[PDB]
Amino acid sequence: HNRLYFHSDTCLPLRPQEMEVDSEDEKDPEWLREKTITQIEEFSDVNEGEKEVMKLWNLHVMKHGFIADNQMNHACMLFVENYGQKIIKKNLCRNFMLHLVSMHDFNLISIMSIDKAVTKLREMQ
């Protein structure tokens, strides 16, 4: 054509076959995900425990980009469909229940979703 374009992360030039820019959907920065994990662990005076369930949730909302409150019912359901298997491995079942209780206190989830979620979690036990 030809204007020559370059990648933003890596200032290497963009060959004409690569653009086609970009089929991939943007984005979740990986460094942010690592920052959150390292930032939660940084907490003196938090359960191991509570940290791990918080990290899983943080990663979960970051991955899907929840904006709204009505999403939080669907969000707690997705969190067991995707991270529920890992929750059972780490013996995080009751902290995940505390999270559901918290989320209800913040007025985000209906109470019918606490039961409906622990049911689905224990249904894959």
Partner: peptide, 10 residues
């Protein structure tokens, strides 16, 4: 057709 994906260590 893809470029090499360079790892980025922050």
């Amino acid at each position: 057709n893809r470029p090499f994906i360079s790892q980025k260590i922050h």
